[PDB]
């Protein structure tokens, strides 16, 4: 197959752009405490989780797929798969948290002042980390470096999570597909939908108690940003979570069609979220888009 070349290329590119983007968001948000509002504290947690995605997924998903063997051994399989699942779970819950914070800030603006504090933000970060660390514990427990023999008559091992009972693995990947997609997705669609209605009713009230051209364009750009975030969240995660649900129910024939190059692309789409979120948040918030200039 020729496609491992375009794997190497696009993984290298999105790795570079992700380590850069996240390292810059980190340096900006740590080195300018005047940036560290609740929303930017969440964006720090997001960029940390997306750097963790980049470091603990991308090499460990390319190089094992380029060599078609998990060279690093069982403890590295368990640890990397744990940091993958954790970074995914944190990144998701942090997107949900940002979406709910924004819904408070715009749709419930006076109540928001009661409870959108740095103490509440750090509480909810600590909670979402502790929760993700808790629910991801099955990855080091039940991921085993199950052996095979490759066609060159060399024994090689594959890192696979293999929670023994097949129906129990279907149950686990159903619960994961719910709590890390459908509930996040429904909650984020409710949040940004109600923000959308709360801005569109303002547009109609302005056109039909003061407004200006650039202040309408700002609202349009917000509706664009929110739609783009929702769509790119679906485009990033629904492919891999549906691939997993297929592997859960239809394992052998599901994996046969998607093993190798297909899942390499699907996982590159999944990790594209880790790059887009620095961009479609920090690097397009005008405040940050200037603070990065005022930063080093």
């Amino acid at each position: 197959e020729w496609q491992p070349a375009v794997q190497i290329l696009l993984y290298s590119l999105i790795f570079l752009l992700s380590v850069l983007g996240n390292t810059l968001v980190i340096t900006v948000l740590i080195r300018n405490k005047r940036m560290r509002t609740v929303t930017n504290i969440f964006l720090l947690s997001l960029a940390v989780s997306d750097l963790m995605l980049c470091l603990f997924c991308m090499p460990f998903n390319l190089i094992p797929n380029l060599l078609k063997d998990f060279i690093f051994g069982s403890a590295v399989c368990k640890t990397t798969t744990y940091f993958m699942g954790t970074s995914v779970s944190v990144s998701t819950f942090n997107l949900v948290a940002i979406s709910l914070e924004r819904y408070g800030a715009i749709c419930k603006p006076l109540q928001s002042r009661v409870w959108q504090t740095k103490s509440h933000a750090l509480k909810v970060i600590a909670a979402t980390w502790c929760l993700s660390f808790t629910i991801m514990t099955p990855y080091p427990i039940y991921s085993n470096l199950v052996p095979f023999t490759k066609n060159n008559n060399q024994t090689a091992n594959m890192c696979r999570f293999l929670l023994p009972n097949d129906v129990m693995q279907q149950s686990w990947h159903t619960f994961l597909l719910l709590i890390l997609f459908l509930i996040p997705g429904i909650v984020m669609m409710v949040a940004y939908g109600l923000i959308s209605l709360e801005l569109y009713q303002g547009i109609k009230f302005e056109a039909s108690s003061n407004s200006s051209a650039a202040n309408l364009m700002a609202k349009k750009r917000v509706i664009r940003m929110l739609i783009v975030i929702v769509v790119l969240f679906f485009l990033c995660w629904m492919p891999i979570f549906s691939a997993n649900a297929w592997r859960a129910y239809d394992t052998a024939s599901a994996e046969r069609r998607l093993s190798g190059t297909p899942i390499s692309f699907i996982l590159l789409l999944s990790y594209t979220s880790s790059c887009v979120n620095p961009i479609i948040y920090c690097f397009m918030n005008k405040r940050f888009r200037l603070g990065f200039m005022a930063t080093f």
Binding site: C57, F60, V88
Partner: peptide
């Protein structure tokens, strides 16, 4: 064989 993929 090598049929599979890491969960994420």
């Amino acid at each position: 064989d090598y049929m599979g993929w890491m969960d994420f």
